[PDB]
């Protein structure tokens, strides 16, 4: 990967996949010092020749699609989620995949009509949305309970790849998204540091998120 495994990293001590060596986003010590160290310190993160991996497009923080910007219809929902969530869940569509913010917007904006005007549901179901596109789309958000889980709903973040991931695996852009996703709502506070992954099926009776993803999430750091 783009970092060392020995806490290494700059210019004399180049990663495997990057020379320079750099950082891993979503580590404490995510900065590359003068001297050649990830360190978590100002000291690493603000001299003239450091980087601070935490910021950019490979930052912890990956970008979110608003729900204005994925073309959401009027909700008003406002049941509030106890801050901050000790566990998180790990859903699939069951549906279609798609490649591009469009066709990812589109799929949620169906997602959505069908769990409001289908199914009666104050707003669409999940917390975030995932696409093959790479992009993470807003649902309910860090705050609002959500409706995926009914025995978890008030303790957890719904996450939801778009698509059927039973035979099929998504993208790894989707799997890193989802990842810096759980990890910025660390770095914010909105999920716990020690918290728990699950899976669907972990926590309810159903085959979510589908067999090849929840192999996935195996490997993921923190699953139950
Ligand atoms: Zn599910």
Known sequence: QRWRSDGRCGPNYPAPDANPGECNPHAVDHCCSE??????????????????????????????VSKSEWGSRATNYNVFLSLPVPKVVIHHSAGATCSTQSSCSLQV????????????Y????????????????????????????????????????????????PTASAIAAAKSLISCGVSLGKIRSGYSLYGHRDVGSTACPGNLLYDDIKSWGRYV
């Open 122 to 169: 104050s707003d669409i179901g999940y917390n975030f949305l995932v696409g093959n596109d790479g992009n993470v789309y807003e649902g309910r958000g860090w705050d609002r309970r959500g409706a995926h889980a009914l025995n978890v709903n008030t303790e957890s973040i719904g996450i939801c790849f778009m698509g059927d991931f039973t035979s099929q695996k």
């Open 109 to 120: 904006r169906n997602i959505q009509n069908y769990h409001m005007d289908g199914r009666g």
């Open 35 to 64: 001297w050649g160290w990830c360190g978590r310190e100002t000291s690493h993160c603000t001299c003239s020749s450091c980087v601070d991996y935490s910021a950019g497009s490979s930052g912890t923080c990956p970008r979110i």
